[PDB]
Amino acid sequence: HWGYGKHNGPEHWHKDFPIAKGERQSPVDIDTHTAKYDPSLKPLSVSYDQATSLRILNNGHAFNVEFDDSQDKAVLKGGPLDGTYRLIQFHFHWGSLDGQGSEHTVDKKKYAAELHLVHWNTKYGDFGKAVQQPDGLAVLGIFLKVGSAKPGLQKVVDVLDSIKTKGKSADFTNFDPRGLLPESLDYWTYPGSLTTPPLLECVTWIVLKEPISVSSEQVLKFRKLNFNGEGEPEELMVDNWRPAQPLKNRQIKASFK
Ligand SMILES: O=C(CCCCCCC(=O)Nc1ccccc1)NO
Ligand SMILES: [Zn+2]
Incomplete structure (x- = not known):
């Protein structure tokens, strides 16, 4: 099955998922000098005050809240x-070392991790219908850099020991995702895809310009998770990111000059 190893990683995915070579694949490198400022773009409206988190799950390739x-x-x-x-879940992609881990890059710069807040278009009624539509999902992408600790992330970090292996879940109520946002909501946007199989081309990507800072100790705890299930040989969950794909016939737009 697919994964991030040498024998089943991103360079192999096209054999089972031919859309991997498609026209609107993600992630991409954001060239800041080629991105087009668009004055018609509106500010983002994030309404998370009533969010109800339920559970945290290790699905074998990341952990989802x-x-x-x-x-x-x-x-x-x-x-x-x-x-x-509507927000359905968030997860991260991260590296084995602080200088890699993000999926998107900015002028070829990689960050230590990338947070994806996944939302689906309510006009399609359920998430499974939304992924079949070109405007079905909107994913907010936030970069993580290593520096000062992020207090709002610590509740996530502290539960990871309980979901170390694939298939484990834990109750995770009353978590407020507003503690993961940067100060500014300026963004780049482009049409793209899921970055994991089935790689469906259903995502409007919204990538925030301002990274959040997390401490070395916080990201180190991400790297103690396992791709494998309990009782199987240990494989550390690191480098669960897809490399940048060709932009092809797409323009990246910026909300800011
Ligand atoms: O791809 C992304 C960003 C969006 C992820 C959306 C959730 C993943 C998911 O549900 N994938 C899926 C969709 C349809 C069928 C099977 C899996 N990050 O890796
Ligand atoms: Zn993701």
């Missing part, structure tokens, strides 16, 4: 989006 998406509790609107997108 899942939210109740049965009502318009935590929504994303505005920016390049039409309509209302």
Whole structure:
């Protein structure tokens, strides 16, 4: 099955998922001098005050924090989006070393990790229908750099010991995702895809310009998770990122000059 190893990693995915070589694949390098400022872009509207987190899960390739998406509790609107997108889950991609781990890059610079807040367009009724549509998902991407600790991340860090191996889950209620946001909501946006199989081309990407800082100790704890299930040989969950893909016939737009 697919993964991030030498024998099943990103360079092999096209054999099972031919869309890997498609026209709107993610992630991409953001060339800041080629991005086009678009004055028609609206500020993002992030309404997370009523978010209800439920559970944290190690799915074998990352850990997901899942939210109740049965009502318009935590929504994303505005920016390049039409309509209302509900938050369903967030997860991270990270590296084995501080100088790699993000999926998107900025002028070829890699960050230590990248946070993806995943939202789906409510006009399609459920997440499984949304992923079949070119405007089905909106993913907020936030870069992590190593520096000062992020207090709002510590509750996530402290539960990771309980979900070390694939398939483990733990109750994770009352987590407020507003503690993961940077001060500024300036962003780049482009049409893209999921960065894991099935690589569907259903994502409006919104990548925030301002990184958040996390401490070395916080990211070190991400690197203690395991790709494997319990009782299987230990494989550390590191470098679960896909490299940048060709931009092809797409323009990256910026909300700021
Ligand atoms: O791809 C991304 C960003 C969006 C991830 C969305 C959640 C992953 C997911 O649910 N994938 C999936 C979709 C349809 C069918 C099977 C898996 N990051 O890796
Ligand atoms: Zn992701």
